[PDB]
Specification:
It is classed as ribosome. This is part of a larger assembly, with chains A, B, C and D. Chain A has one domain: Ribosomal Protein L25, Chain P. Chain A has two helices and six strands, in the order E-H-E-E-H-E-E-E. Chain A is of the alpha/beta class. By secondary structure, chain B is α+β, with helices and mostly antiparallel strands. Chain B has helices at about 45-55, 110-120; strands at about 30-35, 40, 60-65, 70-75, 90-95, 100-105, 130. The termini of chain B are far apart. Chain D has two domains: about 5-70, Ribosomal protein L11/L12, N-terminal domain (Ribosomal protein L11, N-terminal domain, 2-Layer Sandwich), CATH 3.30.1550.10; about 70-140, Ribosomal protein L11/L12, C-terminal domain (Arc Repressor Mutant, subunit A, Orthogonal Bundle). In chain D, strands 1-2 form a two-stranded parallel sheet. The longest helix of chain D is centred in the C-terminal third of the chain and has 10 residues, at about 100-110. The radius of gyration of chain D is 17 Å and the shape is globular. Classes of the chains: A alpha/beta, B alpha+beta, C mainly beta, D mainly alpha. Chains in contact: A-B. Chains A and B meet through strand 5 of A and loops of B. Chain D binds one RNA strand through helix 2 and helix 4.
RNA sequence: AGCCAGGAUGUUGGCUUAGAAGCAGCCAUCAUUUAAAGAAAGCGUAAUAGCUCACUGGUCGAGUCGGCCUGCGCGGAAGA
């Protein structure tokens, strides 16, 4: 039931990702199925308050990117070590 | 006090304490006392903090000490010159980085876990925080 | 009073007041709870 | 009774007269008489049965000392008169110290209606069995 | 948040009760007329008692309460 608005990452690597997290976002990827993996940037606060729920890790999510909808499921989250924030999320298609 | 039962060599080099930690999630228990500062922790500080916790949440609960010393720290005596060998093994520390869950606790309410972890984080030299068991 | 570097509310009547750039604990119930300099 | 004007509740087992070791001037600090626990109180005690303390309201007026009427037998020694050992409770609920048959509590609760809170039999039945919860007295269902 | 009201009974619950009768004690920690109430949260006793509160009603007529992430600051801070 969660709708997560995303964009496509035109840049990647550690420079671009650390630039992207200082701007209060974080990178993510949608892989799985037969399609190519999709690099995605996500707003941070929406996803953090959203993942405070338990249903974020169990229910099918919907990610809106370029006006499409990809029904994914949250595979695996890298968190920051000592701060309450996120590094990265793997989303498997569903 | 914690100390390895049987080492392989008595004296270790200093080495450095860089980068982030490996034990990061609350694994065994439900609430966790996670490091934020770098530092290192002697066995006396781990014992002091564990007694503060065990007293604080009485003999209910279950507490895991997720760090272990296993690093011998040598000191030279007083009025001894420099040189003439490496010192003697005085105590044992664990090296901590930002992210280590130092302790875990289960079987209490969260408000007692806050209370015992406050009581015991004041016996440690590093800045510390409270974490919960997050699900993936 | 007690000049400490951690001043706290010891009672429920204790009350933190900053006077002249100094944090203080003014109690009405017990005057032993009067504190200064947090 | 009225606003609190020199009435307190104190004595021990009133089979005898005027308990000198346990309380003494505790019933002499306020305007309550020393003599009116000795003859007339036992004259008003023999009307039902002896061997019970009485927590009682003693309203001291501008009369001789006061006027007194005993009203209710209390449930402490009423739940100790047939409970088990005569020593006391200690830690009574974590083990099985006492046991009380509930029919006699239904009839004593059916008698006592002045100094209670309740208007139904079942409403005030397990209140005195709450006093059985107090001294760990296991009710026999 | 102020302000005006109510906040008990078994309950001396037994105590090692020398006085604890909620108050130097431990186990319990119940149930009811009731909007509401703890065998008493704070003080307090030679000792009950004395009050306030925890909760509810009225007055009140717009925000308020407490956490988290942060920038800059305050105290901690005494030498010839």
């Amino acid at each position: 039931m969660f709708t997560i608005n995303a964009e496509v990452r035109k840049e990647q690597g550690k420079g671009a990702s650390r630039r992207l997290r200082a701007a209060n976002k974080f990178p993510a990827i949608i892989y799985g199925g037969k399609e190519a993996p999709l690099a995605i940037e996500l707003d941070h606060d929406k996803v953090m308050n959203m993942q405070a729920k338990a249903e974020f890790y169990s229910e099918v999510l919907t990610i809106v990117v370029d006006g499409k909808e990809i029904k994914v499921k949250a595979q695996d989250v890298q968190r920051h070590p000592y701060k309450p924030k996120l590094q990265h999320i793997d989303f498997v298609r569903a | 006090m914690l100390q390895p039962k049987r080492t392989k060599f008595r004296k270790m080099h200093k080495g450095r304490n860089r980068g982030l930690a490996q034990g990061t999630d609350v694994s065994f228990g439900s609430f966790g006392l996670k490091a934020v500062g770098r530092g290192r922790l002697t066995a006396r500080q781990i014992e002091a903090a564990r007694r503060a916790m065990t007293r604080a949440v009485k003999r209910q609960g279950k507490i895991w000490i997720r760090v272990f010393p296993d690093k011998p720290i040598t000191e030279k005596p007083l009025a001894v010159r420099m040189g003439k060998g490496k010192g003697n093994v005085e105590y044992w520390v664990a090296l901590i980085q930002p992210g280590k869950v130092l302790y875990e606790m289960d079987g209490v309410p969260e408000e007692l876990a806050r209370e015992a972890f406050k009581l015991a984080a004041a016996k440690l030299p590093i800045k510390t925080t409270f974490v919960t068991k997050t699900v993936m | 009073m007690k000049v400490r570097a951690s001043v706290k509310k010891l009672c429920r009547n204790c009350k933190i007041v900053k006077r002249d750039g100094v944090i203080r604990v003014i109690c009405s119930a017990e005057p032993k709870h009067k504190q200064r300099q947090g | 009774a009225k606003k609190v004007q020199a009435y307190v509740k104190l004595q021990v087992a009133a089979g005898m007269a005027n308990p000198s070791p346990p309380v003494g001037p505790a019933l002499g600090q306020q305007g309550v008489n020393i003599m009116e626990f000795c003859k007339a109180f036992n004259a008003k005690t023999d009307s039902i049965e002896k061997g019970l303390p009485i927590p009682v309201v003693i309203t001291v007026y501008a009369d001789r000392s006061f006027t007194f009427v005993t009203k209710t037998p209390p449930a402490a020694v009423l739940l100790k008169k047939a409970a088990g050992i005569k020593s006391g409770s200690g830690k009574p609920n974590k083990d099985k110290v006492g046991k009380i048959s509930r029919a006699q509590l239904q009839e004593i609760a059916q008698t006592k209606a002045a100094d209670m809170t309740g208007a139904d039999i079942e409403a005030m039945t397990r209140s005195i069995e709450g006093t059985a919860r107090s001294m760990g007295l296991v009710v026999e269902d």
